Design a protein around this ligand. Sequence first.
Ligand code: SRM
Ligand code: SRM
Ligand code: SRM
Ligand code: SRM
Ligand code: SF4
Ligand code: SF4
Ligand code: SF4
Ligand code: SF4
Ligand code: SF4
Ligand code: SF4
Ligand code: SF4
Ligand code: SF4
Lengths: 363, 363, 417, 417
Amino acid sequence: EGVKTDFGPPYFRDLLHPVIAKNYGKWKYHEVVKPGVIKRVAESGDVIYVVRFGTPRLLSIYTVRELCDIADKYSDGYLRWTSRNNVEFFVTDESKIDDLINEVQERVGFPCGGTWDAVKGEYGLSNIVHTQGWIHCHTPAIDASGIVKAVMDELYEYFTDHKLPAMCRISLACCANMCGAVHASDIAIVGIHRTPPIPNDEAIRKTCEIPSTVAACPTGALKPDMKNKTIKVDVEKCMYCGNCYTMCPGMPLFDPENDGAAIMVGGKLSEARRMPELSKVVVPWVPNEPPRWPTLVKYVKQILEAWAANANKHERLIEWVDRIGWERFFELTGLEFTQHLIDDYRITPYFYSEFRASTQFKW
Amino acid sequence: EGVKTDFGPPYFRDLLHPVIAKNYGKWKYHEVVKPGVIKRVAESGDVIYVVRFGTPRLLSIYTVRELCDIADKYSDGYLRWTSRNNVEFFVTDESKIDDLINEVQERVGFPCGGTWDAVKGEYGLSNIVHTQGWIHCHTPAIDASGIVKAVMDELYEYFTDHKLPAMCRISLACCANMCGAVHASDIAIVGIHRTPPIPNDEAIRKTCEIPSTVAACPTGALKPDMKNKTIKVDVEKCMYCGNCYTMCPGMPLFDPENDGAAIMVGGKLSEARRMPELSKVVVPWVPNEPPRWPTLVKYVKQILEAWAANANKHERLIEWVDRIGWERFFELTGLEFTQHLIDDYRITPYFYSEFRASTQFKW
Amino acid sequence: SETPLLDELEKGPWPSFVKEIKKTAELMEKAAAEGKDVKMPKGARGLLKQLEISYKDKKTHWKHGGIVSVVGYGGGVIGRYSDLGEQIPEVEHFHTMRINQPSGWFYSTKALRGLCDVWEKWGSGLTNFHGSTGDIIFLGTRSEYLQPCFEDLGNLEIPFDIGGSGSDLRTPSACMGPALCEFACYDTLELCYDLTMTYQDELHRPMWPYKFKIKCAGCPNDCVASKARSDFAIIGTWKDDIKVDQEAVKEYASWMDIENEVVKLCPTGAIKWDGKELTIDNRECVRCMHCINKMPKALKPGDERGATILIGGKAPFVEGAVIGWVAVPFVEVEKPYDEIKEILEAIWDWWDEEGKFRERIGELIWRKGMREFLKVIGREADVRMVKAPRNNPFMFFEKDELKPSAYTEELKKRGMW
Amino acid sequence: SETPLLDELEKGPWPSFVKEIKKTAELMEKAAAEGKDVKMPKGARGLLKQLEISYKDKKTHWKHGGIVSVVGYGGGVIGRYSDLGEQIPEVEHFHTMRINQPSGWFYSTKALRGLCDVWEKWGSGLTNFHGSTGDIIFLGTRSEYLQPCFEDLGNLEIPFDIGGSGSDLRTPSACMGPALCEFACYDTLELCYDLTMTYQDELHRPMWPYKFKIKCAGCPNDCVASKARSDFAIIGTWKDDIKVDQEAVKEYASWMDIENEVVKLCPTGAIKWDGKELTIDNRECVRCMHCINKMPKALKPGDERGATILIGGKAPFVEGAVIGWVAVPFVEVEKPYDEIKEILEAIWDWWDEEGKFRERIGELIWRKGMREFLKVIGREADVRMVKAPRNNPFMFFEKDELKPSAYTEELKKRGMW
Ligand code: SRM
Ligand code: SRM
Ligand code: SRM
Ligand code: SRM
Ligand code: SF4
Ligand code: SF4
Ligand code: SF4
Ligand code: SF4
Ligand code: SF4
Ligand code: SF4
Ligand code: SF4
Ligand code: SF4
């Protein structure tokens, strides 16, 4: 017979709640009832309650099962995740909504929240999108799971309620690869190195293809050394990006004392109000201080508090800076501007600044 | 003994009007009287009328002697030119303001205008800052003095009156060397070639510095032949900038049939209301048609008139665009948008887009 | 304690990733003592241990991987090797298997349990729900188990295939779209599914200069973050009037500050409110959503629906981070989506022909010019592709645009034209 | 008609350059028959004839020139030859002499009548008033006449020296400033002349990798286009409050629509007007000037005055057109300007030592980094240098900002430090 292949994922229509399958594509409006709870009303009269809980993204198989017992009890055997790794349950009986929330809180320790309501103008802080870190990755500068947990501990009250005046997403990348929309977050934590590679000639000769390793350096800092059939690095051109180590095991650049995180802010994806935007560095570096990263967490809370206190309704972080200017931003966040924050990444072309990176245009 | 050298220009302070001399750095207010007339009142109290006329930039020494005669009669022996090559006159006899005007056009045939009144928000259109062309320059794609003759002519009544809703500058450049304020004007005419150079090997061996000519090409299209010892050109990589011909006489790229002007738009120098902007192509090429350049004059005026017609008090061309967007700019001007207008100049760094190219910022 | 640093992160209100790891070791180890068939009972406990050593060192203890895969595929499994493998043998090999999620992450409990039954037999017990591309992450198994693990997945009542990795079409994903959401301009979940199935070969068997990702968003709010984390972002839009229930507006006026919370915040002044009637000039609108977002009982996306395609989104390496830019202002989105498939296949052919080793589609277009990209997809230049025209005059002209001349003549007789 | 095409261009209302060229030759040839010492009467006629062929052919008829100059100077004269040098003998040589302008292009009538006499003697009679950089242009003379011309110019009653060309300091220029303008934040004319004088050697004897230009604007209206046309643009500004006469503003508001023409049009809404009083929030103002331009009787620059320095403005070649960016947010402008001269000389020293052949300063900064540029002029980084912080995390760190580590010790041990 042979082994089955090329059959793809299960067809989603067969995993939808009957009330979802029925009203598919025929909704009237949605209404945010309270943090964690969204009422959705179909054309046909059907009313469905979408209830949202935060998760550690990394789940035990025993946890997923318990979530399975819960969904059988309250949502007729149906559930979904959101694109931020929240998990969501569907309840047709409004009387059982608080029963659900209390049962998940009890059985798995996940909290009900993560929603926002543009209608009223009151916004929760949702989950932090993030990567493997030290749990699984070979190129991290910082941990992802430890830090998300440390930050969520400090800002918990903003996930379970709608206390902010605009959307604020927080995202983390354990190195400059990003592995997420971390480069386009209102606040972004990005793992960096601050030290050049030390070429290990034996490992380079054995395992690295030299011309593609050299072509991976954005600054031209690497050159082939034909004589010893290896690579030479010019440290004056290196900015510790790490892309040569991704290509080549013989180019390690990790230094646990000098690896750490940059804090970026002001990205936006959505189009509402204001075109989309790449985040920008405002804190060059904070160290790794596991298990709780107090320095990094303090700067994150400091930036969040300052925006939230001065933001008008619907005015996200980049929109706030749009109004106040960067001079005030640095003043009000109590942050220092230094020469590091002046862009010198040469390879990117000016013409990109002139391409419409947005769905906003008139017909 | 030997020549007196290193002596610099004559002390400006000695080439001044008595009234300008006393009141220097001490005025209460200015006040455009009609088009072309400018009242100034000193803290002292003495009144001055600065009077402004069209100069064809290029002058005969005899149109200058004559200028002097006029000037001794009316402006006590003094006069000056301005940053756009108009010539200003200094009557303080407030009835001799208007015998002058006459006696200045009676003689040399300069018209009084080039003014604007931001206060009442009515505006004239000043001189076109241009370069040299076929008169003296050896790399021109278009003729400065000639196209400027035509264009002014066809627009003469914007010069002689306060007919526009905001400030508009027209400027010219004979080649991509972009001499003058062409990179940042409201409307700009720029000579371009559309043909790559055919190398003259006879004239490269005897003249050119091959390594530097090569290293002068922005897209790196030029490569040193070692045979033969000459320069060869990858035509797929050539955008006909003419730079290689500035370095080296054996690289003509002139084709009388395909050289032309490009028309660019939406530059701004002042800081008033909105930050400085570099000009932008809206028409890729219009032909040389000496003596009258009808195709060139037609487009130019069509562009301004669609902006006259629609603009608000103080609303500059870049500022109108900011308001309508590029989609409607092309519709109202009747121009089409083609692929030539999508930027593909690789070399300029994106990080330049993030530097503050302006004097507007907060203390 | 064996884990004094990680024990700190069992404290605090936010649900703890450390408790998930410990719960897995407790219960995997307890499944094995009872004589249930579980291949890796010690793996989640070696993961904890290695992780605690990483916390003390402030560094990763993973080293570069060998290539590993299932029979017949070239991607979907990331090989991972610990540098601590002799001290902690249960994590010497600890690879991830990416499992393709159902469109918009919808599941039934029967589908999750089969997955939990499979991963418990062949792996560590640890998972990510979800990996950032969208896949389910099966985190931690050995090489010998990858094949029988995949054979079990395909044999399940509700079977699951492997997602993408490497230089392939990655696992496409989609926002909830019309399953839950009233703003959706096309069937996001249906398109995602159809692309996944059409291009199984492309996804399973990496053939290309590098990776290529597609994400589908129902509307411009982009709740899957397509313009930033896919090369080919498909984003719902519309061409005709916003639909206005005028009664519903007055219901909003009775309590909402409409002037400040709506009117004033439209990017283009599109939308005036005068106390009795709401107007949209849709010719000014740019579909930025906000007013619809603000008044979901009264305002709706127009009737003539489709997608805008933005091209080139990517993380920084090598030439810089990209939010994708307009490639196709408007394309229709109906099954079997031939117009979209046509565009995709053309891009892939050109890219496999001209791309360098590890060159992303965004980078290739920066190198070749939008003129060549547009010729490849058979569409014309459009003002909506740019945010401003070029600020320099160094334009390339097509040979056929030039006048016939003595010089064009010399160029042919010199073989250069 | 000797000139059918050029004759079309004596028609029209705009002052004719073709008239001016005819007016010259006629008169210079008229003088030469009368025995006045006119070394080049044929010149202007030559030019006209050359030009008519150019108009017919639609191409220049000037060729590449060998280097030419006066004795003691390396710059000031542009060597020019015609490719019709045999057919037209009097334009085989036709060099320009750049002649330094007084600051602000202010002249007395004697000063002018002197130049006129020297050039009628030794040259074509044709001039430019003025060239783009600002010099008076003496258009077309011969190699042998250059030196005697220069001797006579200096020997004038009111004497003029040669301006700049080549890889030198070009002739600085300046707006009218405090001669006429009630907006002048500092004395532009003194600074221009003082600068022209202090660096005479740098202007006359090119020693640098390329050209360097300075332009001086009285205030941020930038009336000499300094940010676009000079590498080092010194633009007036102020640190304290815009000064406001309340009764003058009521005179304005009886007839001016201050709400729409002033208040609404402010880039940051620093200015307010309720009908009895105008109010300026100077913390908010970016001194864009508009309100001052709109209400010159009522509003003035503040009293704490100096300038802002924008660096690097230039035309496209090689790396692109540049409007200069913030280098020094505030500097004092008082004689003898040693804080400014300090900056200039520090910049040159660095540029002469680091710059490549034909590298402009803005392109050196682009290549080396603002940090290095900042260290050179002894100034700190300041948020006011950028429109935004950088969009990527690829930061360089100084060796000494690093924490001592086993790793940095390894670096030291190998000589990579
Ligand atoms: C469920 C989820 C889609 C999915 O398939 O999972 C989703 C669901 C909805 N999104 Fe979203 N959005 C979701 C991701 C996003 C993302 C993508 C991301 O953050 O990674 C964004 C772009 C982030 C950014 O813009 O930088 C996103 C930007 C929005 C916008 C824009 C907010 C703005 O003010 O700029 C709206 C408008 C709004 O607030 O109503 C929105 C609105 C909505 C509405 C209310 C749509 C509707 O009419 O039902 C849904 C309810 C959201 C709520 O809590 O109020 N959704 N939405 C996503 C939930 C994420 C979570 O757990 O928090
Ligand atoms: C005569 C001249 C000074 C000089 O030293 O030569 C000059 C003189 C004045 N300029 Fe200017 N500007 C002069 C070059 C410029 C040019 C530079 C150029 O085009 O070459 C512009 C910058 C162009 C740009 O921004 O792209 C310039 C930008 C301004 C601004 C701009 C208005 C705006 O909305 O952007 C003001 C505002 C106003 O009063 O209208 C201004 C206003 C003035 C004022 C009103 C200043 C004052 O307080 O008296 C002067 C009266 C002229 C008038 O017509 O209103 N002047 N001014 C300039 C010679 C040009 C000419 O002959 O027309
Ligand atoms: C193979 C490697 C590590 C490396 O540096 O060689 C890697 C490479 C990379 C690297 C480098 C590379 O490709 O060689 C980059 C940079 C590519 C570039 O052009 O700049 C990269 C951009 C992303 C991006 C941004 C979009 C893009 O591709 O640019 C995303 C976002 C997305 O897919 O939605 C992303 C989503 C993951 N990326 Fe990624 N990513 C890895 C993990 C992941 C996942 C598993 C992390 C996660 O926690 O979710 C994410 C995917 C799992 C899934 O199937 O859903 C990863 C190994 C983890 C391990 O061994 O366990 N990576 N990953
Ligand atoms: C030497 C050469 C061309 C050559 O290779 O022989 C030249 C070089 C150039 C070349 C540079 C080169 O080839 O070395 C270009 C390219 C500059 C660049 O770096 O991109 C150029 C940018 C300018 C610019 C742009 C400002 C800037 O670059 O910062 C300006 C504007 C300014 O200085 O205010 C400018 C002002 C003139 N430029 Fe220019 N320019 C020449 C003419 C002129 C003048 C004399 C023509 C005119 O009267 O309009 C201009 C000034 C007269 C004066 O001295 O007052 C010129 C020949 C003189 C001749 O007429 O025979 N040139 N000229
Ligand atoms: S962001 Fe870096 S460390 Fe984190 S998973 Fe992606 S590649 Fe690995
Ligand atoms: S770390 Fe980055 S900048 Fe440095 S040599 Fe490696 S690839 Fe180049
Ligand atoms: S723009 Fe070019 S052709 Fe015109 S004068 Fe300047 S260098 Fe010569
Ligand atoms: S004309 Fe310009 S692009 Fe073409 S070969 Fe010469 S320098 Fe290079
Ligand atoms: S992208 Fe649009 S259609 Fe999709 S879940 Fe978001 S708001 Fe709804
Ligand atoms: S979608 Fe945006 S631009 Fe369109 S009217 Fe509504 S809020 Fe304005
Ligand atoms: S820059 Fe200012 S000071 Fe100089 S003339 Fe222009 S308006 Fe007056
Ligand atoms: S100078 Fe400009 S920013 Fe300042 S108050 Fe006046 S109009 Fe506003």
